[PDB]
Amino acid sequence: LAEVQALETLLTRELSVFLTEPGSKKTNIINRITGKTYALPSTELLRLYEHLEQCRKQGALMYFLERQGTYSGLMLDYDLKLNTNAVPPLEPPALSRLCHRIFVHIKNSSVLPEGSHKIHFFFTLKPEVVQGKYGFHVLIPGLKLAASTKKSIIGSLQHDATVQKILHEQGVTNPESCLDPHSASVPSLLYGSSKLNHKPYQLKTGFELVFDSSDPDYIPIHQIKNLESYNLVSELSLTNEQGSLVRPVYCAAMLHDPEARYLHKILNLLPPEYYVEYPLW
Amino acid sequence: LAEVQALETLLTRELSVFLTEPGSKKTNIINRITGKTYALPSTELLRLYEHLEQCRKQGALMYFLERQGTYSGLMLDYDLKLNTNAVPPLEPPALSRLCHRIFVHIKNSSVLPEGSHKIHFFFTLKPEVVQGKYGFHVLIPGLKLAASTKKSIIGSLQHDATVQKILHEQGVTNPESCLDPHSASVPSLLYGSSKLNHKPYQLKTGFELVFDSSDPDYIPIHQIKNLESYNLVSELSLTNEQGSLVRPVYCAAMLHDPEARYLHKILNLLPPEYYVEYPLW
Numbered sequence: 001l002a003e004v005q006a007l008e009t010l011l012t013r014e015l016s017v018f019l020t021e022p023g024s025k026k027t028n029i030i031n032r033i034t035g036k037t038y039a040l041p042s043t044e045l046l047r048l049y050e051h052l053e054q055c056r057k058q059g060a061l062m063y064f065l066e067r068q069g070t071y072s073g074l075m076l077d078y079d080l081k082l083n084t085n086a087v088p089p090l091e092p093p094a095l096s097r098l099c100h101r102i103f104v105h106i107k108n109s110s111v112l113p114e115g116s117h118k119i120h121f122f123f124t125l126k127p128e129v130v131q132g133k134y135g136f137h138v139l140i141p142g143l144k145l146a147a148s149t150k151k152s153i154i155g156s157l158q159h160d161a162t163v164q165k166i167l168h169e170q171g172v173t174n175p176e177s178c179l180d181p182h183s184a185s186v187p188s189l190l191y192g193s194s195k196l197n198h199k200p201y202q203l204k205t206g207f208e209l210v211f212d213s214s215d216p217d218y219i220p221i222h223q224i225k226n227l228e229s230y231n232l233v234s235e236l237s238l239t240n241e242q243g244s245l246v247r248p249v250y251c252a253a254m255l256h257d258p259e260a261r262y263l264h265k266i267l268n269l270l271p272p273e274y275y276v277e278y279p280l281w
Numbered sequence: 282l283a284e285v286q287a288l289e290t291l292l293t294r295e296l297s298v299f300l301t302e303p304g305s306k307k308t309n310i311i312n313r314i315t316g317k318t319y320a321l322p323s324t325e326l327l328r329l330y331e332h333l334e335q336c337r338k339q340g341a342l343m344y345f346l347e348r349q350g351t352y353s354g355l356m357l358d359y360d361l362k363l364n365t366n367a368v369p370p371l372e373p374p375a376l377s378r379l380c381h382r383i384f385v386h387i388k389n390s391s392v393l394p395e396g397s398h399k400i401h402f403f404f405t406l407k408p409e410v411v412q413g414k415y416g417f418h419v420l421i422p423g424l425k426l427a428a429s430t431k432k433s434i435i436g437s438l439q440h441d442a443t444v445q446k447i448l449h450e451q452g453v454t455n456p457e458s459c460l461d462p463h464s465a466s467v468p469s470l471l472y473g474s475s476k477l478n479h480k481p482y483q484l485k486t487g488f489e490l491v492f493d494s495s496d497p498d499y500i501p502i503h504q505i506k507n508l509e510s511y512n513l514v515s516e517l518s519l520t521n522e523q524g525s526l527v528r529p530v531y532c533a534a535m536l537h538d539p540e541a542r543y544l545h546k547i548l549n550l551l552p553p554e555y556y557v558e559y560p561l562w
Contacts, residue, residue, distance in 0.1 A: 093491070097499045104498070162496050210374075215443055217385070218378050 003054040010051050011036070015044055022255075028239050030065040030187055033196070035257060042242055049190075049234040056192030056200075056233060063196060065187035066239045071253060073141035073238035074150055075188045076102070076157065077180040080134040083171035087129060090136070092205055094166050095123050096221050099207050101163050102138065103219060105156040107211070109149050111251035114213040119143045120224065120246050121209065122236050124191065124201035132173075137189075137201055141238050142246040146253045150184035191236040203232060284335040291332050292317070296325055309520050311346040311468055314477070316536055323523055330471075330515040337473030337481075337514060344477060346468035347520045352534060354422035354519035355431055356469045357383070357438065358461040361415040364452035368410060371417070373486055375447050376404050377502050380488050382444050383419065384500060386437040388492070390430050392532035395494040400424045401505065401527050402490065403517050405472065405482035413454075418470075418482055422519045423527040427534045431465035472517040477537055484513060 018038045020027040026039035099121045126135035158179050167175040194200040206224040235246045299319045301308040307320035380402045407416035448456040475481040487505040516527045
């Protein structure tokens with residue numbers, strides 16, 4: 001495929017010069033398919049996002065992660081157990097109310113800057129329910145938060161009675177324990193990417209929330225209408241600062257490497273029945 | 282015109298039996314063109330609304346008023362003085378915020394019933410600015426309020442700093458004194474009707490507000506999308522209780538006929554300074 005070939009050329013010929021060592025904090029981008037780690041400057045991050053976006057629109061297999069580090073956008077990872085194997089409705093009013101409640105906790109952290117600011121919420125959903133297991137990500141990529149503040153906001157969100165109600169009325173049986181408390185620290189999948197055993201989450205709905213410190217009781221939340229007009233890998237990225245839709249608002253602060261060849265014996269080192277080993281160890 | 286002929290037949294042959302005397306309290310409907318007053322039961326009100334709606338869709342001259350009486354929907358009459366003769370933008374975010382502020386005053390009146398309820402807001406706008414004079418009606422027809430509560434809500438709304446800001450940013454030079462304090466008591470034009478010297482206000486945008494006593498901080502406001510699907514004379518009526526979109530929520534308790542011919546005489550009669558006449562009376 002042309003756009004995959006283009007991404008391959010960008011990675012090997014050009015971005016190879018930004019390859020980081022294993023466990024290097026400088027790392028912002030992880031390609032879990034090639035097992036490569038990169039520290040991309042903003043210019044080269046954007047070029048990557050243009051290629052990943054073209055690959056996304058053609059349904060290409062991607063497994064890119066961004067590292068959140070100490071100061072970046074907020075991601076909420078919900079792992080739902082459902083009543084049934086039916087995708088829950090999750091219509092705009094429920095998602096709109098979720099945004100409001102998420103914002104109340106952000107505001108209560110006291111780190112928002114004074115003045116008038118737009119922040120965008122994006123809901124990406126697991127494409128199907130598998131054995132009653134369902135998922136969504138809430139991405140607030142533009143709202144640049146300290147890791148410690150994200151952890152605090154996530155702690156508060158787990159105990160939110162209104163959020164638990166919304167999730168319950170959607171058919172969620174684990175509304176108390178569905179929000180991953182490590183949402184603040186885990187590397188976050190780029191839009192169009194997934195674990196190799198899963199399919200990528202799909203953008204259902206995005207919302208624009210405006211807050212004004214002078215008028216704190218007015219918190220307008222509206223659906224974003226022309227989402228398709230933007231580079232979604234770009235806009236949804238927690239570490240991006242050069243989005244068009246998403247403009248930053250700054251808040252107060254495995255080594256065996258088989259390389260697709262040697263792992264085959266791994267596939268037959270599991271179904272030995274060799275638990276008990278008197279001579280067989 | 283057929284639909285005007287139909288309305289004429291309904292009024293003279295059928296509804297004539299509901300004609301009220303001048304100053305009757307039973308009156309709910311006033312036809313200021315025919316100078317007739319009626320007390321229509323709900324069945325005959327609906328039949329009227331079907332005919333008025335057909336007449337409205339064909340741009341027919343109507344001057345129907347409904348009397349608010351002591352318990353009915355809320356109407357806000359804004360008379361704006363503007364910076365310019367340009368229609369102010371009044372886009373959904375400004376109107377959405379207006380609804381929220383209007384609701385805060387309704388809630389503060391303490392008369393809302395407990396539980397979950399939808400209430401609809403409709404904004405009808407003066408079709409053009411004339412010498413910087415502009416207008417809109419806010420109709421909350423489903424929210425059945427005591428006259429005394431409406432007066433109280435209107436009093437509070439006049440002094441609302443956020444509403445004054447919104448109106449100021451629209452180019453309103455009288456944001457302190459543009460809301461008619463008699464909005465609670467005046468007879469209210471049916472949708473498609475107007476004073477004989479004015480053109481009828483046009484429905485620009487309607488909003489659905491859901492309130493829940495159990496979850497008071499969640500106040501979702503969304504544009505209504507399929508407005509054209511409904512009988513708008515019917516839905517927008519403050520005294521109607523049998524709308525399809527608008528379901529009631531119960532809160533705690535001369536003749537001119539110029540035919541475009543003598544308007545010329547009015548236009549040439551006023552300019553002389555002969556209002557007093559000692560030799561030419």
